[PDB]
Structures are given as C-alpha cells and as structure tokens.
C-alpha cells in the first residue's frame, strides 16, 4: 500500500502550492511510520535533488515545523538532537535531559550514543558531564551508558529482598544518605527486577520509594531519582504525567508535548493514552485538542492515534 515515490510527489506539490498546503503535508507524514518517512525522504531528494528536511523547514513555521522536522529524524537522531538542545549553553533545562536519559532502554541508548557521536563529533557522556555535577552527574552518566543488567531466566528473590533492604539502609533508616548505593542499585539492576524491589521496599520503609526520595535528597538529583523511579514503576503513566504537566494551566510547554508525542507515537502511545484517561478523566486527545490549534493541533492529534 505504501508508495514512497507517490508520497514524495504529493509532498512536493503541497510545498509548491501557493501559500503552502500544510494539511496535505501533515495528513501524509503523521500517518506514516518513522521508517516510511525515511523512505519518503530518500524518494524526495531522488526526485527533486533537494533534501526534504530543508524543503520543509523553509515551507513550514512555528510549532508545526518543529513537529514535522522532529518526525523526519530517526528515533536515535531525534533523541540525540533533543539531548543536544537540552544541554545547549548552560543547559539549564535539566528536566528534558532527565526525561530522555531516565526513560530510554539499553538498546535505545546504545544507538543514541553512537548517533550522537556521529552527529556532534563528541561523546554524549562528555556533554552530560558539562551540564551536570555532584551525584546528579554520577547518576546521569551511569544511566546514559545503557548497561542495565539483562533479565535472568529465573527471578532472584534473595537479591530483590537484598536490594530492598539496602535501599532502606542507605536512606530513610540512617542520618544522611548513601547516594552511591542508591545509584548502583537503580542503574545496574534490570527494570523488572527493580519494579519488584520497589514493591518489597514497602516492607521495610514507612515511605514508598518516591516519598523516600523527596525526604532524602533535593534539587536535580532529587528530580532525576523521581523521574527514574516513576519510569521504572510504570513508563506509560510516567509519560502520561509528563504530558499532563506539559498542558495543564495557562499556556503549553511545547518542547515536552512535541518530544513525547513524536518519540512515543510508535512505541507505547496506546498505553500512555489508557493511563492518561484513567488518571485525568479526559482523554489525551481531548487535552491536545484544547491546548493547541490549527495544523499543529491536527499533527499532534494524528500522533495521538485517536480518542478515548
Ligand atoms: O490556556 C491559556 O493560556 C489560555 C486559554 C484561553 O483560551 C485564553 O485565556 S483568556 O483569559 O483570554 O480567555 C488564552 O488563549 C491564549 C492561548 O492559550 C495561547 N496559546 S500558547 O501560545 O500556546 O500559550 C495563545 O494562542 C495564540 C498562539 O499564537 C497559538 O496558540 S497554540 O495553537 O500554539 O496553542 C494560536 O495561534 C495560531 C496557531 O499558531 C496556528 N497554528 S497552525 O499550525 O499554523 O495552523 C493556527 O491554529 O492559528 C492560530 C491563531 O492565529 S491568529 O491569532 O493570528 O489569528 O492561537 C493564538 C491565539 O488564539 O491568540 O494566545 C491565546 C490568547 O491569549 S491573549 O492574552 O488574549 O493574547 O489563554
Ligand atoms: Ca498555507
Ligand atoms: Ca520555517
Ligand atoms: Ca536519611
Ligand atoms: Ca494549557
Ligand atoms: Ca497551546
């Protein structure tokens, strides 16, 4: 059914139409997989001898341009470019750096590290170091390696219990905090293993893992731990909460809204939508529809995949 040559032709016609036909551009690109969009990009240059990304940057503008250009990048290229943006200058946008690093899998991070190095001619780890400090740096650097332990054939309940007590001994139980212990356990163990550790943790601590973080640490280190634990406990819900935060109240934090819709549209959007509706009462579709307008809105609603 998919025809890259046909799509590229229709996009070119839309770009050259007087005033630019954004609707057609959105209708096509937001209804094609990332892989198909790559095929469309090669077909476009093959036909016009011009790069699609460049053509669209000139033809589009505002939030819509941001969405479209983001969709044209491969998953790794997009994440790599988003990370670079968060660390730009004094990289004061720690929240974006945290979101990406705390949610990507070993496989995703392996490709991100590779592409980041190819695109910016520098190791992702070095830029992270420059935009982080203290234990916050140690945690982010560790996570970015994407070297989380694999899932064993058999569940190690003895270790699960061990880690749970260690987490407790390292924080709430003692004066101060043994941050390195928290970092080692939360970055080295597999996600599934940690989901069980956090459950078992409730048997030793009167505060769950999240509340324990709020009482033990502060600042970016605290926020990084909060994002990590949330994502480990329930990734779809984590993104649903970040999305809600990006639209609640006056205005919109477009940087977050666009990045999540673009990066998770083909990953777990169905689960994100379900968690969103369950917690916020309204559908994600409804929130997007109410916080944005025009072609930009249309594009995001297509990435949403539907109403709930
Ligand atoms: O939640 C609010 O912050 C908010 C809600 C209320 O609706 C209203 O509050 S009230 O007390 O006045 O009653 C007020 O509305 C805001 C709106 O929230 C702002 N959006 S934000 O910038 O994202 O924070 C903003 O909206 C204007 C923006 O330029 C833009 O909004 S959005 O689509 O990004 O959400 C939109 O402008 C274009 C839009 O970019 C185009 N998109 S396309 O992809 O190119 O097709 C397209 O949709 O057209 C619109 C409108 O174009 S026009 O304005 O040139 O005709 O909408 C803008 C707008 O509606 O003004 O500002 C409004 C109004 O706030 S103000 O203080 O009265 O100026 O706040
Ligand atoms: Ca137009
Ligand atoms: Ca432009
Ligand atoms: Ca303590
Ligand atoms: Ca809003
Ligand atoms: Ca808005």
From Swiss-Prot:
PROSITE patterns: ANNEXIN_1, ANNEXIN_2. There is a cross-link at residue 18 (Glycyl lysine isopeptide (Lys-Gly) (interchain with G-Cter in SUMO1)). GO terms for molecular function: cadherin binding involved in cell-cell adhesion; calcium ion binding; calcium-dependent phospholipid binding; calcium-dependent protein binding; cytoskeletal protein binding; identical protein binding; phosphatidylinositol-4,5-bisphosphate binding; phosphatidylserine binding. Keywords: Acetylation, Annexin, Basement membrane, Calcium, Calcium/phospholipid-binding, Extracellular matrix, Host-virus interaction, Isopeptide bond, Phosphoprotein, Repeat, RNA-binding, Secreted, Ubl conjugation. It is found in: Secreted, Extracellular space, Extracellular matrix, Basement membrane; Melanosome. The keyword RNA-binding applies. Annexin repeats lie at residues 2-73, 74-145, 158-230, 234-305. The modification N6-acetyllysine is found at residues 18, 121, 196. One of its GO terms (cellular component) is midbody. The keyword Calcium applies. It comes from the Eukaryota. InterPro entries: Annexin, Annexin_repeat, Annexin_repeat_CS, Annexin_sf, ANX2. It holds the Pfam family Annexin. The modification Phosphotyrosine is found at residue 168. ISGylated. One of its GO terms (biological process) is positive regulation of transcription by RNA polymerase II. The modification Phosphoserine is found at residue 153. SUPFAM superfamilies: Annexin. Gene3D superfamilies: Annexin. It may cross-link plasma membrane phospholipids with actin and the cytoskeleton and be involved with exocytosis. A pair of annexin repeats may form one binding site for calcium and phospholipid. Belongs to the annexin family. Calcium-regulated membrane-binding protein whose affinity for calcium is greatly enhanced by anionic phospholipids. It binds two calcium ions with high affinity. May be involved in heat-stress response. Inhibits PCSK9-enhanced LDLR degradation, probably reduces PCSK9 protein levels via a translational mechanism but also competes with LDLR for binding with PCSK9. Binds to endosomes damaged by phagocytosis of particulate wear debris and participates in endosomal membrane stabilization, thereby limiting NLRP3 inflammasome activation. (Microbial infection) Binds M.pneumoniae CARDS toxin, probably serves as one receptor for this pathogen. When ANXA2 is down-regulated by siRNA, less toxin binds to human cells and less vacuolization (a symptom of M.pneumoniae infection) is seen. It is linked to Increased expression of ANXA2 is associated with hepatocellular carcinoma tumor progression. Heterotetramer containing 2 light chains of S100A10/p11 and 2 heavy chains of ANXA2/p36. Interacts with ATP1B1. Interacts with DYSF. Interacts with COCH. Interacts (via repeat Annexin 1) with PCSK9 (via the C-terminal domain); the interaction inhibits the degradation of LDLR. Interacts with CEACAM1 (via the cytoplasmic domain); this interaction is regulated by phosphorylation of CEACAM1. Interacts with APPL2 and APPL1; targets APPL2 to endosomes and acting in parallel to RAB5A. Interacts with S100A4. May interact with UBAP2. This is Annexin A2. It comes from Homo sapiens. The lineage of its organism: Eukaryota, Metazoa, Chordata, Craniata, Vertebrata.
């Amino acid at each position: 059914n998919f025809d890259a040559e046909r799509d590229a032709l229709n996009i070119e016609t839309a770009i050259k139409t007087k005033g630019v036909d954004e609707v057609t551009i959105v209708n096509i690109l937001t209804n094609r997989s990332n892989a198909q969009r790559q095929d469309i990009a090669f077909a476009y240059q093959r036909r016009t001898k011009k790069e699609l990304a460049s053509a669209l940057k000139s033809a589009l503008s505002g939030h819509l341009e941001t969405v479209i250009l983001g969709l044209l990048k491969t998953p790794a290229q997009y994440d790599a470019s988003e990370l670079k943006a968060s660390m730009k200058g004094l990289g004061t946008d720690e929240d974006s750096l945290i979101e990406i690093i705390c949610s990507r899998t070993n496989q995703e991070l392996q490709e991100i590290n590779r592409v980041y190095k190819e695109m910016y001619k520098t190791d992702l780890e070095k830029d992270i170091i420059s935009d982080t400090s203290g234990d916050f740096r140690k945690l982010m650097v560790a996570l970015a390696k994407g070297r989380r332990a694999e899932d064993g054939s058999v569940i190690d309940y003895e270790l699960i219990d061990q880690d749970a007590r260690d987490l407790y001994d390292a924080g709430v139980k003692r004066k101060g905090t043994d941050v390195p212990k928290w970092i080692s356990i939360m970055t080295e163990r597999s996600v599934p293993h940690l989901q069980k550790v956090f459950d078992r943790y409730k048997s030793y601590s009167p505060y769950d893992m999240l509340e324990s973080i709020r009482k033990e640490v502060k600042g970016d280190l605290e926020n990084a731990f909060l994002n990590l634990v949330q994502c480990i406990q329930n990734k779809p819900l984590y993104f649903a909460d970040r999305l809600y935060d990006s639209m609640k109240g006056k205005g919109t934090r477009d940087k977050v809204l666009i990045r999540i819709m673009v990066s998770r549209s083909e990953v777990d959007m169905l689960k994100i939508r379900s968690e969103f509706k369950r917690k916020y009462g309204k559908s994600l579709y409804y929130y997007i529809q109410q916080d944005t307008k025009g072609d930009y809105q249309k594009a995001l609603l297509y990435l949403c995949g539907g109403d709930d």
